[PDB]
């Protein structure tokens, strides 16, 4: 009940409190006959006559109303933190009336102690949180959350985001060339400012467009990060199973020793530990059948040869069937160059906006949205297969290219060229990293052309 | 089994393998001995329309 009235970060406290309850059960069970702890837990979690407990449901509720819209991912530290004040979307939770100390940690002093202990987990979301989330949700909880996140991403991509993409696409300049180096970086910066003025001035660009994209990005990051936690959880389970499943590590080999002749000797030492064979030797048919099934479940984990992030992306690409994303066929029968009718071009304009330096005491796009915004934008680009043309045709990348050449530094429309290109470089490094990662997980027929034909034949 | 079947839908094979850092060829290149032979202006006579 406490967890249901707090945010996702309080799940670490829930886990610690549950462990204290488990200990209390153990201590009491020495003298009393109580229901199994797991049976008690599932009943309280309403997970006996229902597929998903209260914990799993609340985790999803919090993802939907708090995590996705309010958190900013930091790829360098691998942690999420909360956004800025004006973007913090509050949702009032019904308070929980505290009970007597014995129903919590035991006493007032202990309540304080543990409360402080878990206070170090309230200001961010990272591996420790994900680790707990994995353990409490299990395969079935993680699966439903992933399925539900896909529905959220689909709702946003085919909904508000699509609407605003189609809107801004018309606000976009019909065509936009990349000026020759000759014009100079200052002039190029001025050219882009004019061509993309209506995107720069679009009132709901951040409050809506960036916000929606940040949510999609956070959803994607959650799927990736949760799978990684699950992999760590599985590998540790497997390490402890090894002894009972006849799995030995490589042994050292002195002179006159053969691993073949030694590994088999070691296997005899741990023979009494090989579970299945033992039960097949002394157990009843019922015991044997149950042992074979349990042994199968124990050795078969996702980390053994299965992954999800790939499927996640694959299904998201199917959410981008609207013709607006890819646009009409190119005039040259190959690819668009000057036209702004593909998404990555719109993203280039958006990138131009968030690369613009702000006041010393203003908050930046990274301080407000985190990396989630860019994970979304790059994901759409990659899934559309526009990452290569984006690299070539991006406005900011061009400005950076030219500025590095002429080394000029002015202030065009209150935009210090030097700082402008310094930020572009940062986002370039970030974009490359994300795109490379997406492409990596995303791991035939080539459109050929006809050579000139003699009018004769 | 029910829980695993539910998450199995969201999975696919991760095609990872394991090999060696360096794999030598089955047959190493044979050291050819140097033998002097005179310039021969006829070695291209069978290539295209040659002239003997």
């Amino acid at each position: 009940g406490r967890f249901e009235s707090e945010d996702l970060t309080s799940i670490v406290e829930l886990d610690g409190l549950l462990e204290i309850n488990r200990m209390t059960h153990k201590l009491l069970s020495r003298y009393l006959t109580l229901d199994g702890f797991d049976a008690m837990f599932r009943e309280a979690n309403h997970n006996v006559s229902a597929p998903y407990g209260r914990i799993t449901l609340h985790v999803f509720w919090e993802l939907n109303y708090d995590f996705l819209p309010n958190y900013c991912y930091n790829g360098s530290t691998n942690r999420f933190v909360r956004t800025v004040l004006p973007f913090s979307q509050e949702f009032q939770r019904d308070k929980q009336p505290n009970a007597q100390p014995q129903y919590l940690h035991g006493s007032k002093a202990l309540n304080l102690a543990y409360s402080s202990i878990y206070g170090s987990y309230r200001n961010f979301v990272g591996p420790p949180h994900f680790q707990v989330i994995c353990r409490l949700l299990g395969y079935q909880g993680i699966a439903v959350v992933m399925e539900e996140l896909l529905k959220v991403v689909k709702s946003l991509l085919q909904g508000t985001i699509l609407q605003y993409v189609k809107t801004l696409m018309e606000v976009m300049p019909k065509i936009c060339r990349l000026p020759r180096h000759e014009y100079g970086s200052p002039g190029i910066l001025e050219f882009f400012h004019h061509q993309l003025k209506d995107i720069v001035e679009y009132a709901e660009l951040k409050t809506v467009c960036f916000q929606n994209l940040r949510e999609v990005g956070n959803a994607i990051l959650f799927c990736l990060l949760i799978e990684q936690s699950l992999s760590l959880e599985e590998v540790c389970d497997l390490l402890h199973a090894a002894p009972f499943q006849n799995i030995l590590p490589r042994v050292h080999v002195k002179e006159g020793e053969r691993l073949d002749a030694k590994m088999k000797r070691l296997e005899s030492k741990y023979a009494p530990l090989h579970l299945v064979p033992l039960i097949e030797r002394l157990g009843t048919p019922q015991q044997i059948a149950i042992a074979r099934e349990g042994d199968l479940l124990t050795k078969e984990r996702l980390c053994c040869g299965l992954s999800m992030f790939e499927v996640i992306l694959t299904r998201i690409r199917s959410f981008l069937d609207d013709p607006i994303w890819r646009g009409p066929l190119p005039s040259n029968g190959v690819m668009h160059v000057d036209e702004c009718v593909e998404f990555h071009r719109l993203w280039s304009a958006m990138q131009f906006v968030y690369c613009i330096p702000v006041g010393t005491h203003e908050f930046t796009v990274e301080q407000c949205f985190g990396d989630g915004l860019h994970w979304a934008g790059c994901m759409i680009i990659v899934l559309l297969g526009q990452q290569r043309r984006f690299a070539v045709l991006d406005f900011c990348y061009h400005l950076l290219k030219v500025q590095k050449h002429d080394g000029k530094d002015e202030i065009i429309k209150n935009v210090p060229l030097k700082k402008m290109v310094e930020r572009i470089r940062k986002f370039q490094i970030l974009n490359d990293e994300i795109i490379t990662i997406l492409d990596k997980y995303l791991k035939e027929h080539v459109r050929c052309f006809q050579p000139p034909i003699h009018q004769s034949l | 089994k029910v829980a695993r079947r539910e998450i199995g839908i969201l999975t696919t094979n991760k095609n990872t393998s394991r090999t060696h850092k360096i794999i030598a060829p089955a047959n190493l290149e044979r050291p050819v001995r140097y033998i002097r032979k005179p310039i021969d202006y006829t070695i291209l006579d069978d290539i295209g329309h040659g002239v003997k």
Partner: peptide
């Protein structure tokens, strides 16, 4: 090595 427990 297919994992039947995950419906494979």
């Amino acid at each position: 090595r297919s994992m039947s427990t995950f419906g494979k």
